[PDB]
Amino acid sequence: SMEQVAMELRLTELTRLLRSVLDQLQDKDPARIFAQPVSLKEVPDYLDHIKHPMDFATMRKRLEAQGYKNLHEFEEDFDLIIDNCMKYNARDTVFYRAAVRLRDQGGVVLRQARREVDSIG
Numbered sequence: 165s166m167e168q169v170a171m172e173l174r175l176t177e178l179t180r181l182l183r184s185v186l187d188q189l190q191d192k193d194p195a196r197i198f199a200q201p202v203s204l205k206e207v208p209d210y211l212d213h214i215k216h217p218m219d220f221a222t223m224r225k226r227l228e229a230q231g232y233k234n235l236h237e238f239e240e241d242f243d244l245i246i247d248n249c250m251k252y253n254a255r256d257t258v259f260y261r262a263a264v265r266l267r268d269q270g271g272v273v274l275r276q277a278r279r280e281v282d283s284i285g
Contacts, residue, residue, distance in 0.1 A: 178281070179230050182238050185277045186227060189242060190220050192269040197262045198245050202252075213252050218244035235281045239274060 193199065201219045202210050210217065223241050232238045246263045253259040 174285075175230050175233070177284070178232065178234070179227060181277065181280060181284075182227055182232055182235070185238070185273060186220070186223060188273045189266070189270045192266050192273075193220070193262065195258075195262055197259060198249070198266065210252070214248045216244055216248070218248060220245065235278060242270065242274075 190199070199220050201217055201222060202214075204210055218241050223238070223245075226232060226241070227238075232241075246267045249259055249263040253263075255261075
């Protein structure tokens, strides 16, 4: 149908916007701490601690399959990156501290993303 096409164009454009959001958030992680899944070879107990691992590469795979229907779903995954790290790692670690900085700096980007998503519809 024409409606299904219009819906699909909307999703494509959301994907475009979320791709720019993802790039901006990932720039706030210059150390690349969050770039890839925590290695289960190197952290064999990880899934005993963290039930829903997340990382920027995994988000990018979902994004490119158009697997984010709305900004809430995308934000859920970003918050998992931060929150998983802040539980597994102690406050006095470079990992915890990187997550705090990513949360703080990402807030700004996500605030305007939400306005853009609502504005453009």
